[PDB]
mmCIF file of C-alpha atoms and ligand atoms in Angstrom:
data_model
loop_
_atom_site.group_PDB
_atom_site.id
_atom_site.type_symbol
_atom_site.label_atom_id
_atom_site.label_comp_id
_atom_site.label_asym_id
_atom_site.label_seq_id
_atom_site.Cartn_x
_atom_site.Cartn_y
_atom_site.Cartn_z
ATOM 1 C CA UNK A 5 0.000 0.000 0.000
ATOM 2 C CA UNK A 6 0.772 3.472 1.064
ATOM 3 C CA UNK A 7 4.738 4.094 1.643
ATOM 4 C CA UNK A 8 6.987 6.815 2.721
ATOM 5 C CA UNK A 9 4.035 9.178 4.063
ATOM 6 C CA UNK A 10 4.756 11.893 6.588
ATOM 7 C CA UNK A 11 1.592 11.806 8.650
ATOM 8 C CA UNK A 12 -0.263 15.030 9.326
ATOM 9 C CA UNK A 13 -2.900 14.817 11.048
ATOM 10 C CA UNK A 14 -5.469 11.213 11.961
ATOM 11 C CA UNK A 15 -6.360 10.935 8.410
ATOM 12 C CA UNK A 16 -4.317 13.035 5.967
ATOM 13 C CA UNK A 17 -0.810 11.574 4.986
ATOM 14 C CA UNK A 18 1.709 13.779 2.808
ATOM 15 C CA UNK A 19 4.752 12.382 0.295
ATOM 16 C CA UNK A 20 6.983 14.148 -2.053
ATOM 17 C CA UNK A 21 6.111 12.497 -4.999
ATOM 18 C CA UNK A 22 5.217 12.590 -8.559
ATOM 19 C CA UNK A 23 1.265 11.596 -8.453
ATOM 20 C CA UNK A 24 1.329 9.381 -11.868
ATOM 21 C CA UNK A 25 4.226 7.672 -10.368
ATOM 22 C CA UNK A 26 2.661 7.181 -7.080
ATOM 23 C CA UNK A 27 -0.671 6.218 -8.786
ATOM 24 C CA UNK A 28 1.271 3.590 -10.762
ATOM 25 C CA UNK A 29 3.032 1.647 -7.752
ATOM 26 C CA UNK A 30 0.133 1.877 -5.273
ATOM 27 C CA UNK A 31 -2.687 1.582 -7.593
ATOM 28 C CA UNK A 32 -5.048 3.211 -5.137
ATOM 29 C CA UNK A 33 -8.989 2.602 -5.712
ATOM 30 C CA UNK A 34 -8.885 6.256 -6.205
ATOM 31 C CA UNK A 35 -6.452 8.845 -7.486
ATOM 32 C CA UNK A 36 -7.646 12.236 -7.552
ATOM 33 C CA UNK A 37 -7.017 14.939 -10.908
ATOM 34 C CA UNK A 38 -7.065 18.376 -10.551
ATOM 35 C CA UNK A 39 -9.904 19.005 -13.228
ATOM 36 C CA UNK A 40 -11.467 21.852 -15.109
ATOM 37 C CA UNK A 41 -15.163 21.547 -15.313
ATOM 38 C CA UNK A 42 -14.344 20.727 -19.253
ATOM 39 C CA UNK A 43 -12.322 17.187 -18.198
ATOM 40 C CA UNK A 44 -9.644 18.627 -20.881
ATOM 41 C CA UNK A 45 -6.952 17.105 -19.292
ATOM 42 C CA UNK A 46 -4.291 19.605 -21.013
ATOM 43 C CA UNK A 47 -1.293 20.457 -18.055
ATOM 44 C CA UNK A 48 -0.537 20.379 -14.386
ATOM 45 C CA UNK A 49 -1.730 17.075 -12.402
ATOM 46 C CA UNK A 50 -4.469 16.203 -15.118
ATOM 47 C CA UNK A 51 -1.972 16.540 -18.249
ATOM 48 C CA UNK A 52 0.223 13.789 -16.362
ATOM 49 C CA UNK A 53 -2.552 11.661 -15.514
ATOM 50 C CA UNK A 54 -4.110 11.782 -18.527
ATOM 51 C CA UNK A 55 -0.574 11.101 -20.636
ATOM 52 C CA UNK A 56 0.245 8.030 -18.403
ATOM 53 C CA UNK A 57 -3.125 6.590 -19.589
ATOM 54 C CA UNK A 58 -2.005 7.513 -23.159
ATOM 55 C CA UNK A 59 -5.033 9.726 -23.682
ATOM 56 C CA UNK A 60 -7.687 7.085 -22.634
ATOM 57 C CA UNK A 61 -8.585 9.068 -19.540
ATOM 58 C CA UNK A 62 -9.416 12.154 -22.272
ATOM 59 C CA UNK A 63 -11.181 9.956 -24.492
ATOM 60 C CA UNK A 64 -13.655 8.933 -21.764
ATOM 61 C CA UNK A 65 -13.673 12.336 -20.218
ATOM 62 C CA UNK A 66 -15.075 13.582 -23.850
ATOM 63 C CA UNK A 67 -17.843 11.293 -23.624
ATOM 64 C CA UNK A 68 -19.039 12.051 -20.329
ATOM 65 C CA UNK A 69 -18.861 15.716 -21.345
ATOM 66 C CA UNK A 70 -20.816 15.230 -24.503
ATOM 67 C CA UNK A 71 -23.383 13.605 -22.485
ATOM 68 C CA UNK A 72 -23.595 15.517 -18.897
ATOM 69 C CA UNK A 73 -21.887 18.855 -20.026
ATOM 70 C CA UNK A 74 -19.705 20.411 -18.121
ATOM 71 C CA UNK A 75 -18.812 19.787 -13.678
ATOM 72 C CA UNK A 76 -19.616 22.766 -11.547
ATOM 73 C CA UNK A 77 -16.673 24.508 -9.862
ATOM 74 C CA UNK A 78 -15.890 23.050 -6.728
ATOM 75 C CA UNK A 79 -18.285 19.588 -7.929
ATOM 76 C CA UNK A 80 -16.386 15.887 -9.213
ATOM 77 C CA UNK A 81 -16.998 13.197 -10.954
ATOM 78 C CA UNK A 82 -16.222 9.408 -10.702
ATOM 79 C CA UNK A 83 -14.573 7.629 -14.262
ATOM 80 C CA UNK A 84 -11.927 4.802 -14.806
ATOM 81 C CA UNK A 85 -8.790 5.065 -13.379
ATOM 82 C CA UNK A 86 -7.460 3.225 -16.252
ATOM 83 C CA UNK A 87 -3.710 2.024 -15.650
ATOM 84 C CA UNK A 88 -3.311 4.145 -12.508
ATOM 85 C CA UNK A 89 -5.971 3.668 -10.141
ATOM 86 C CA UNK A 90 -10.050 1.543 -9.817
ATOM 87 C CA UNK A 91 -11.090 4.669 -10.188
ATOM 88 C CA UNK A 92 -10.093 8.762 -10.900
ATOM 89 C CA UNK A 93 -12.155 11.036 -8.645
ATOM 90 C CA UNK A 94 -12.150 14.293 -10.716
ATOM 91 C CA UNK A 95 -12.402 17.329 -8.632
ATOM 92 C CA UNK A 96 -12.529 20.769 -9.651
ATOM 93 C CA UNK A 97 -11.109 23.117 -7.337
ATOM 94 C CA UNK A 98 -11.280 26.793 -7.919
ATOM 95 C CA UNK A 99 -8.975 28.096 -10.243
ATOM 96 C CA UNK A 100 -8.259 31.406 -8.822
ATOM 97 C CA UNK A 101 -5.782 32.306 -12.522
ATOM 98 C CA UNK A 102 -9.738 32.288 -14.049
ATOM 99 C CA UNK A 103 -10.105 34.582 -11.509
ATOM 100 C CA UNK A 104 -12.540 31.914 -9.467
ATOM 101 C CA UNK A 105 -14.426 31.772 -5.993
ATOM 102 C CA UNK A 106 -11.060 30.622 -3.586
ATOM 103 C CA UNK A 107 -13.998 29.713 -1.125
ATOM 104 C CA UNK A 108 -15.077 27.626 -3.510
ATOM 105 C CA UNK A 109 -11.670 25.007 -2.070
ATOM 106 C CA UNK A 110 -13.713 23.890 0.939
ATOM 107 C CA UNK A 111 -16.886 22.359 -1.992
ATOM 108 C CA UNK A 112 -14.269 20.857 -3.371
ATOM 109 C CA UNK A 113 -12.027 19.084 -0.926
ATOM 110 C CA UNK A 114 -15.762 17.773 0.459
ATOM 111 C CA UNK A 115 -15.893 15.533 -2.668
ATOM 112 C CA UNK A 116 -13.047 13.607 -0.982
ATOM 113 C CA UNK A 117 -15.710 12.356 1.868
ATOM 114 C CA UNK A 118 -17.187 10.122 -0.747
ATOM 115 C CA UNK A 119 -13.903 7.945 -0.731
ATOM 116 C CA UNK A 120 -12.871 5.791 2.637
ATOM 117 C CA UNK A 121 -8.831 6.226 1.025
ATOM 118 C CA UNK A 122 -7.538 8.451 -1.810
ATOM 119 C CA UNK A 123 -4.227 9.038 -3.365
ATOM 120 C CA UNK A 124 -4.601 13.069 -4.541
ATOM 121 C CA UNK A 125 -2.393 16.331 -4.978
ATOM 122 C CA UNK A 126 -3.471 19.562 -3.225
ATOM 123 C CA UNK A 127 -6.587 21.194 -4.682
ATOM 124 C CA UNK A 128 -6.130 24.318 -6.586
ATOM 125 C CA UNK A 129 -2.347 24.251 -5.894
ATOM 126 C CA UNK A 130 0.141 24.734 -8.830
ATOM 127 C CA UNK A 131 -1.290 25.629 -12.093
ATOM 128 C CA UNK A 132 -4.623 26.639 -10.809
ATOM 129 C CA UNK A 133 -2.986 29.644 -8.505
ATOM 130 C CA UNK A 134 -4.074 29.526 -5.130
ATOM 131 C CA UNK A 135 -1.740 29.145 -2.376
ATOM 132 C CA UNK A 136 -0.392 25.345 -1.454
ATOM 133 C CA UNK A 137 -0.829 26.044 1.739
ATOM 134 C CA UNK A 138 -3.894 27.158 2.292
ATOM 135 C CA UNK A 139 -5.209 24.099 0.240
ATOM 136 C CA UNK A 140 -3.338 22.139 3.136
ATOM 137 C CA UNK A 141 -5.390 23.799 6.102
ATOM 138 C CA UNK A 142 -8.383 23.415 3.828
ATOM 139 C CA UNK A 143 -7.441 19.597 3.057
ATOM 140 C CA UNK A 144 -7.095 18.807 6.753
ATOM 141 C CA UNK A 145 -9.875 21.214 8.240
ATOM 142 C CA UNK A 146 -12.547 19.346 5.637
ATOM 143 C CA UNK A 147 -11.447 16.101 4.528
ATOM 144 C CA UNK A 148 -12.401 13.205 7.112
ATOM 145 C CA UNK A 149 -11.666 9.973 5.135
ATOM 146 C CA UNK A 150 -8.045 8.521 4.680
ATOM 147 C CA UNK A 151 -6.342 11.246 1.976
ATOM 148 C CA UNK A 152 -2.678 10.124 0.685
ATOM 149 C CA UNK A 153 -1.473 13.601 -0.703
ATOM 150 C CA UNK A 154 1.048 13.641 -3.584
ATOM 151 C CA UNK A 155 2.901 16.880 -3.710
ATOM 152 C CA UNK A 156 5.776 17.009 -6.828
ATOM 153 C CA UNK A 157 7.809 19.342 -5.535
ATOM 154 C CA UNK A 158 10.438 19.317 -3.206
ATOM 155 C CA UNK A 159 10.866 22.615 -1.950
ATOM 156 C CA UNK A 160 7.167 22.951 -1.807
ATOM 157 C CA UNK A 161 7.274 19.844 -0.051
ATOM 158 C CA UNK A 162 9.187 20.861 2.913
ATOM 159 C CA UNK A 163 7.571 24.336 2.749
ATOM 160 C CA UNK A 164 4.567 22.642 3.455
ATOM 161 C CA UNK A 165 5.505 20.227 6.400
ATOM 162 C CA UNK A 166 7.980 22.676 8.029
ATOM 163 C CA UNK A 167 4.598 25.768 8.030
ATOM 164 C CA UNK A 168 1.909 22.837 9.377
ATOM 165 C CA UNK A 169 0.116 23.683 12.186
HETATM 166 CL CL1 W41 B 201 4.706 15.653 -15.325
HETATM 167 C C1 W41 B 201 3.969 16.087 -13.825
HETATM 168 C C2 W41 B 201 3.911 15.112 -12.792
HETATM 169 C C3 W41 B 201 3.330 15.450 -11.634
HETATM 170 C C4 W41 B 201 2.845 16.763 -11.525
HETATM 171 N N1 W41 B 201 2.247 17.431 -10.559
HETATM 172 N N2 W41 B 201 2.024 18.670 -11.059
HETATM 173 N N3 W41 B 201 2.454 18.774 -12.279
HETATM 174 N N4 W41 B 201 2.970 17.567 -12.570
HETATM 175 N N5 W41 B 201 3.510 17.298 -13.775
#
């Protein structure tokens, strides 16, 4: 299962690791991607994820959005993990670059509930411009099932444990 975790709090676990590498060892029931209500998979966490499933995880993501339309911000969905996981939870955190709701994080991380154990990188962290750690009190202050977080940088990485409260 689970290695190498630096354990935060009772039920969320942190490792500085590359997600699609993680997801590929462990294959968790669920991995979490950092969605856009689209599903287009195109950079950050969800470019990776979708690449290591060599584009399958886009090709289903385009038929669920042909027939539901698009998520809400701060709303998931549950599709085939493919080669990484049983299943990818996709969550869509705010992403405060579209100049999005920030309060929106809290909706988001709730999604995790759903799911007794998931492997998942912070919520609108990197690419989606809202500040790591914030996402981390958010994570911890909302989540209440078992979440394995995935963070791919170093420095960040230690930024984050070393500022924990
Ligand atoms: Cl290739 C790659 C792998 C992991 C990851 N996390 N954020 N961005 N990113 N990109």
């Amino acid at each position: 299962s689970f290695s190498g975790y630096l354990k935060l709090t009772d039920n969320v676990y942190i490792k500085n690791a590359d997600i699609v590498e993680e997801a590929k060892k462990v294959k968790p029931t669920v991995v979490v991607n950092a969605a856009n209500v689209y599903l287009k998979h195109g950079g950050g966490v969800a470019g990776a994820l979708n690449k290591a499933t060599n584009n399958a995880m886009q090709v289903e993501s385009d038929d669920y959005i042909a027939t539901n339309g698009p998520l809400k911000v701060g709303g998931s969905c549950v599709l085939s993990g493919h080669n990484l996981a049983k299943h990818c939870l996709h969550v869509v955190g705010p992403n405060v670059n579209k100049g999005e709701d920030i309060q929106l994080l809290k909706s988001a991380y709730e999604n995790f509930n759903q799911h007794e154990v998931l492997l998942a990188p912070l919520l609108s962290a990197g690419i989606f411009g809202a500040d790591p750690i914030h996402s981390l009190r958010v994570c911890v202050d909302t989540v209440r099932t078992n979440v394995y977080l995935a963070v791919f940088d170093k420095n960040l990485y230690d930024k984050l444990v070393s500022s924990f409260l």
